[PDB]
């Protein structure tokens, strides 16, 4: 039975979290999202000009074409790309998937034309909102899933030091006490849960929904939630400069706390504290606006403080502090 | 109990074929398409000079926003469009659908730029491929299923003349005899059916799967079952010009049959001469490649010989020559 164990860095302020991954024989840093479910990826079909800086796949080398399939994707964030589609090898720590399907690039917006830092996207929602047509295909991790020991992964991702993603066992050096598993509602194809209630600093509220989500940087919370936390921030005030609230660096923060299945998942106020705000000498937030979309985002801040089990059996999600 | 009937119409040479949707009390002329499950249409939010030659939803007058929702979509003819999210009311012969996702383009590619005989495409493939993010909205349809006397709709496409499309109740005088059933695979959103058979002329054949699709235009098939059809067609040629086989407008074209759980749904030599080529005097055929994407389109070219029920429960689709 397999099982590995991939290596993640973390980008400058933690923004994101790369990790190698050979494909056709060529290795490119990617950026993995549970938040999405295609694997995409720079190719020699963009612009030669949008190739430099990056480690790009010749789809041409060691891929087969699925004639007439195309993928096209938006973010959130409001990136997005699109492209045609070849199947091809793609290892991820020592695990290796025959047939893949990997989304070739053709067209990419602005934002990831500026980011250097990876070569494309491995999605590891869930399957069923992968976007390629005219059929769907499977991320890599439901391509594995049967040849691991145990159909999960889990993830580690720490503040400035390198962190894991395991494939198909649990490191149990990797967080304190036991494992608190909770159901995952996977209806929207995401690896969604639900908390009982959570505490902002002094507040404390009711619960709501939100997703387990390694490819967003922050936390995202309610307006009224954030605005609730900052209400206790010494001076904290919203500067579009940077992208949200900021405050002065040397602020004590509130720490953040949400009840899952009876679990108290804590995300302390040092953490809440992501980085110069890039506006001169603020700090930006670690915590911000969901934009109204009816759910919450709990992004790498929050899974910073946590080791977090995704367990296709349920499925469901396992929880504990990280080591 | 539900049930209305909306009137089809088919543009020139049967191309397309477009149904008054009255949105937010604009009526649009829109192109149905059982072959994706997104309803969307030109709005307000695209360049003034692309609303040109449309009816256009203005979302601001009736429309509630979505914040933070897009879409993209891609179609299997290339063009492309994408946009924000809307819910308002929606209604199609009589029956309305409240609070139903309207999708506002903001971007239209070159093909729909060009074509003026519609004003969006309103999907009835299942809602499972609607591509909204980040949670996906359902089609008109399953909005208004539960509501209608029973969970179907059905189609009656016509050369030349208007066809209908009936929600909610079987109209028996559309067709003779009595419908024959076939299961539906909707695991990849398509009604998708297997065929047993097929005859091709003088020469049969196995079977194969394709999907009942009212918005392509034709009857697209695999290159082998192409070159089998032109073979038997004297004269019959590859021009780029006119996109695919053309042949000399007098000539005699044989039938083209399939077998669907003993039934024989036949389309008569007549229906496969689609119509003038556009280059010369040629007349382009009903039957095109499927550019190998491993399973056949049932077009409209098809459609027009059949009437077909669209049934939720199975799901299954129903069969009976046109009257
Ligand atoms: C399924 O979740 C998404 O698609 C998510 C969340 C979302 C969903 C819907 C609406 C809004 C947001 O977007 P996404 O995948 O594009 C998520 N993108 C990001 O987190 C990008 N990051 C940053 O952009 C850093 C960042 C800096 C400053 C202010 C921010 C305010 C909110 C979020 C991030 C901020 C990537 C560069 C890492
Ligand atoms: C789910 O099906 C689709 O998305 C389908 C089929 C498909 C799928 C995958 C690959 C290729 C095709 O494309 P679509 O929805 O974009 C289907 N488009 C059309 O039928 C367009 N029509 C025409 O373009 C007329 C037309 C003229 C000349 C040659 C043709 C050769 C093939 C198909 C159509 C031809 C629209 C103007 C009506
Ligand atoms: C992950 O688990 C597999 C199966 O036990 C091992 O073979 C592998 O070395 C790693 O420990
Ligand atoms: C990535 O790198 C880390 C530390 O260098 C290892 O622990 C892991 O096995 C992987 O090789
Ligand atoms: C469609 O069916 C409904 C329910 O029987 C009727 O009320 C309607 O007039 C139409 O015949
Ligand atoms: C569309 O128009 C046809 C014929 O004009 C009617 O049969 C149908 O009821 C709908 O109004």
Redesign the pocket.
Known sequence: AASGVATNTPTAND??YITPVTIGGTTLNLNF?T?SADLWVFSTELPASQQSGHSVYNPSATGKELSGYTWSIS???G?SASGNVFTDSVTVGGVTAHGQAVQAAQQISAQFQQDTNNDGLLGLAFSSINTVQPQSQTTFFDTVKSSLAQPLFAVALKHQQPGVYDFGFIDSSKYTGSLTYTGVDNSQGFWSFNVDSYTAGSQSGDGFSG?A?T????L?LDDSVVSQYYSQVSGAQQDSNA??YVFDCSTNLPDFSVSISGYTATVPGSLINYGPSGDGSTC?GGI?S??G?GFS?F?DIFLKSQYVVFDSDGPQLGFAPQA
Chains 1, 2 share one sequence.
């Open positions: 923004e994101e999202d938040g973010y959130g964030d990136s997703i989500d490819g967003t940087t922050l995202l992208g949200g930006l911000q969901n934009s979309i985002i992004g």
